[PDB]
Structure 1
Amino acid sequence: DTNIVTLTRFVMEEGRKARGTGEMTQLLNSLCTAVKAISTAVRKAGIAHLYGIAGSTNVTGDQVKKLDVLSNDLVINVLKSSFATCVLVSEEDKNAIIVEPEKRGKYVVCFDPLDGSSNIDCLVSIGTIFGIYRKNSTDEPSEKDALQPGRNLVAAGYALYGSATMLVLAMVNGVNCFMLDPAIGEFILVDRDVKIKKKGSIYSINEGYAKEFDPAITEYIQRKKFPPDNSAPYGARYVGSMVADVHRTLVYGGIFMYPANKKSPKGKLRLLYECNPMAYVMEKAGGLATTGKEAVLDIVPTDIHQRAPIILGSPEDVTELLEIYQKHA
């Protein structure tokens, strides 16, 4: 009660004996500040009249909400004043953002300031997603620095603005969950070294696209509904916000799917700031994440707004699906 394991202490006690410049702590502290401010805005957006659009479209196709702009400004301003980043990639920005020389640090940050756009006006769980890369190159910071495979992630996670506000942080040694104490504005450790179940009992996809689905997806869904071995069929769940569906997959187990489809070869979700962070978290928890043909973290992007199919969750559920794709290959 008078001893709190906050995110700061953890990340500090984390990279301690293995020292470091400490700018990961500065990065994560700064981020936490932006997530706290987004959280307070969301919890009263109707009053504050934050619902509604911004009158703008993203890079490939999205209707920019007021909360998109707000959350985007916050995350950028705090990452910049952290002195720990050099290249920023945002869903909301066409081009990568280069940090002014004076405030530059060594990290590249890819983020979705607010994910789950379609769920905002109905008060369903929304979130923030981030992926952090160390800049390798020794030359001047540029968009290219963001064009790294998710395998090179140093840190990844998301803020979920659900019934409680949660910060899920994945780093090289594992996954940790931090819940926001609204009274003292601190992210506190509630779940240490999170591991996903080997197999779940929930499947999660927008079956409104059944008509475009590939035979592999089609077959898998039928098998969830009609188990060949007479086991209980899987329950269905699709919140509509990636951060919510993925967090349920993490803690409950099972599978989440936004596959490629007859109209969308690379699916819908963005590899840099949507699929890679979640792929990373999922694998740090003992899970898998795939396109149906290749691991998401092994893809080498060519476009900061590149799309990727993604299938993630319990290794055995993900593998069952993979077998089905292989069989249809």
Structure 2
Amino acid sequence: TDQAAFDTNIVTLTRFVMEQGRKARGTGEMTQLLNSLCTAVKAISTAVRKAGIAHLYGIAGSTNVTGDQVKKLDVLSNDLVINVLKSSFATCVLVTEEDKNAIIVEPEKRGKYVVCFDPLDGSSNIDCLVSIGTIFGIYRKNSTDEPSEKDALQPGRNLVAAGYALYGSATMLVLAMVNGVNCFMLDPAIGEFILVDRNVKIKKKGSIYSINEGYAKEFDPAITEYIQRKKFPPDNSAPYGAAYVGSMVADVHRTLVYGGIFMYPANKKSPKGKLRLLYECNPMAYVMEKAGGLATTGKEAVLDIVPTDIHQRAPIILGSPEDVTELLEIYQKHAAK
């Protein structure tokens, strides 16, 4: 249909819960949440435009000496991305990798929305200005009793909203709850978030794939098989392209468009991959599923584990329900016993 109108309007993130929220007859408590992170999708959004060199220590007021000499900004990100959560007065179990374990919230600033986020999708190789941003997750807190680190030990299948934050050039927060996916391209001129492509649905026939191809030898003859099919497509087909930003997001957000498919299991160096799942190989996985995007580990659906530790890691391979789920009959071609 065609009628893309003129201005006098915007679509923030507040409105998304401010609106849908009451339609669910509630408190607007679920919302006390993500704004603090919305406020973050801009906060660090811009930190990297500067993160490069003469911008951080001194030239920004950085004095909370954290680390040995391998970082500080990263910690500074989450360093306000912590109490900000307390500033919402509704935080329960503030789940964060930065800390060995979470931090159980004080009697006062407590709710029933356990935020489980990665305060940084390993920006590390920030020296190139690649596609990175924020990460998060949450549960409507299943239990009741004095919240210990505990409950952040919950599957995405019983998690109604796990998510990231992509600052490419476009700071665009794709918010999604237990119903669909929706991106909020920000507007700095107005320091305001603005939705853009109303509702997302995972594509079905891609053409680019993601995993690390720099890694031939060590990989397995089951994954190093799905590989063959792209390179050497079998019944007279055309070779799958690829672009590996390296990132989980910057490749698992391409998936949100054109046609990408991450592949990343036990890299042999590591027994499961490189994503500390509970706020790594999950937020994305969840967002795709709502969108009708079949997420998984290759040997297990990413949203269905008994979280055997907070900072536990895991694999994720998702994209085209024909292409990413194609690996079933690849893992199922390599069938020896």
> Rg larger in 1 or in 2?
2
Q: Are residues 202 and 153 of structure 1, via their aligned partners in 2, closer, same or farther at CA, if it must alter by over 3 Å?
A: same
Cα deviations across residues 15-58 of structure 1 (Å, max 9, x unaligned)?
22212121122112111112211112122223553499999999
Q: Distance in 2 between matches of 1:57 and 1:323?
A: 54
Task: Work out whether residues 54 and 64 of structure 1, in 8 Å CA contact, stay in contact via their aligned partners in 2.
Answer: no
- Which deviates the most, 263-272 or 49-58? 49-58
Shift of residue 84 of structure 1?
Answer: 2.2
Q: Secondary structure at 2:204's aligned position in 1?
A: coil
Q: Are residues 155 and 241 of structure 1, via their aligned partners in 2, closer, same or farther at CA, if it must alter by over 3 Å?
A: same
Shift of residue 234 of structure 1?
Answer: 0.6
Q: Are residues 13 and 63 of structure 1, via their aligned partners in 2, closer, same or farther at CA, if it must alter by over 3 Å?
A: farther
Shift of residue 292 of structure 1?
Answer: 0.9
Task: Work out whether residues 132 and 153 of structure 1, in 8 Å CA contact, stay in contact via their aligned partners in 2.
Answer: yes
Cα deviations across residues 265-317 of structure 1 (Å, max 9, x unaligned)?
21111110011211100101111111111100011111111010111111111
Task: Work out whether residues 66 and 75 of structure 2, in 8 Å CA contact, stay in contact via their aligned partners in 1.
Answer: no
Cα deviations across residues 46-89 of structure 1 (Å, max 9, x unaligned)?
35534999999999999953221121112212211112221011
- Which deviates the most, 111-120 or 184-193? 111-120
Q: Are residues 55 and 2 of structure 1, via their aligned partners in 2, closer, same or farther at CA, if it must alter by over 3 Å?
A: closer
Identity %: 99
Q: Distance in 1 between matches of 2:187 and 2:93?
A: 31
Cα deviations across residues 223-242 of structure 1 (Å, max 9, x unaligned)?
10111122211111100111
Task: Work out whether residues 23 and 83 of structure 1, in 8 Å CA contact, stay in contact via their aligned partners in 2.
Answer: no
Q: Are residues 50 and 58 of structure 1, via their aligned partners in 2, closer, same or farther at CA, if it must alter by over 3 Å?
A: closer
Q: Distance in 2 between matches of 1:77 and 1:263?
A: 36
Match of 1:70 in 2: 76
Shift of residue 175 of structure 1?
Answer: 0.3
Q: Distance in 2 between matches of 1:63 and 1:269?
A: 24
Task: Work out whether residues 172 and 184 of structure 2, in 8 Å CA contact, stay in contact via their aligned partners in 1.
Answer: yes
Shift of residue 263 of structure 1?
Answer: 2.8
Shift of residue 262 of structure 1?
Answer: 2.7
Cα deviations across residues 156-190 of structure 1 (Å, max 9, x unaligned)?
21111212111111211100001110111111010
Task: Work out whether residues 260 and 266 of structure 1, in 8 Å CA contact, stay in contact via their aligned partners in 2.
Answer: yes
Q: Distance in 1 between matches of 2:52 and 2:190?
A: 24
Cα deviations across residues 203-254 of structure 1 (Å, max 9, x unaligned)?
1111122222111110111110111122211111100111111111111223
Q: Are residues 185 and 16 of structure 1, via their aligned partners in 2, closer, same or farther at CA, if it must alter by over 3 Å?
A: same
Task: Work out whether residues 11 and 194 of structure 2, in 8 Å CA contact, stay in contact via their aligned partners in 1.
Answer: yes
Match of 2:3 in 1: none
Q: Are residues 317 and 63 of structure 1, via their aligned partners in 2, closer, same or farther at CA, if it must alter by over 3 Å?
A: farther
Q: Distance in 2 between matches of 1:264 and 1:56?
A: 34
Q: Are residues 59 and 51 of structure 1, via their aligned partners in 2, closer, same or farther at CA, if it must alter by over 3 Å?
A: closer
Match of 1:298 in 2: 304
Q: Secondary structure at 2:311's aligned position in 1?
A: coil
5+ residue gaps in structure 1? none
Task: Work out whether residues 208 and 259 of structure 2, in 8 Å CA contact, stay in contact via their aligned partners in 1.
Answer: yes
Structure with the larger helix share: 1
- Moved runs in structure 1, 4+ residues, more than 6 A? 51-63
Q: Secondary structure at 2:62's aligned position in 1?
A: strand
Q: Distance in 2 between matches of 1:123 and 1:15?
A: 36
- Which deviates the most, 64-73 or 194-203? 64-73
Q: Are residues 257 and 222 of structure 1, via their aligned partners in 2, closer, same or farther at CA, if it must alter by over 3 Å?
A: same
Q: Distance in 2 between matches of 1:320 and 1:229?
A: 15
Task: Work out whether residues 54 and 69 of structure 1, in 8 Å CA contact, stay in contact via their aligned partners in 2.
Answer: no
Q: Are residues 158 and 236 of structure 1, via their aligned partners in 2, closer, same or farther at CA, if it must alter by over 3 Å?
A: same
Task: Work out whether residues 41 and 165 of structure 2, in 8 Å CA contact, stay in contact via their aligned partners in 1.
Answer: yes
Cα deviations across residues 133-170 of structure 1 (Å, max 9, x unaligned)?
12111110111111111211121211112121111112
Task: Work out whether residues 66 and 72 of structure 2, in 8 Å CA contact, stay in contact via their aligned partners in 1.
Answer: no
Q: Distance in 1 between matches of 2:298 and 2:24?
A: 37
Q: Are residues 232 and 62 of structure 1, via their aligned partners in 2, closer, same or farther at CA, if it must alter by over 3 Å?
A: farther
Task: Work out whether residues 288 and 313 of structure 1, in 8 Å CA contact, stay in contact via their aligned partners in 2.
Answer: yes
Shift of residue 264 of structure 1?
Answer: 2.3
Q: Are residues 62 and 167 of structure 1, via their aligned partners in 2, closer, same or farther at CA, if it must alter by over 3 Å?
A: farther
TM-score norm. by structure 2 comes to 0.90
Q: Distance in 2 between matches of 1:53 and 1:209?
A: 40
5+ residue gaps in structure 2? 1-6
Q: Secondary structure at 1:158's aligned position in 2?
A: strand
Match of 1:142 in 2: 148
Task: Work out whether residues 115 and 128 of structure 1, in 8 Å CA contact, stay in contact via their aligned partners in 2.
Answer: yes
Q: Secondary structure at 1:124's aligned position in 2?
A: coil
Q: Secondary structure at 1:40's aligned position in 2?
A: helix
Shift of residue 319 of structure 1?
Answer: 1.3
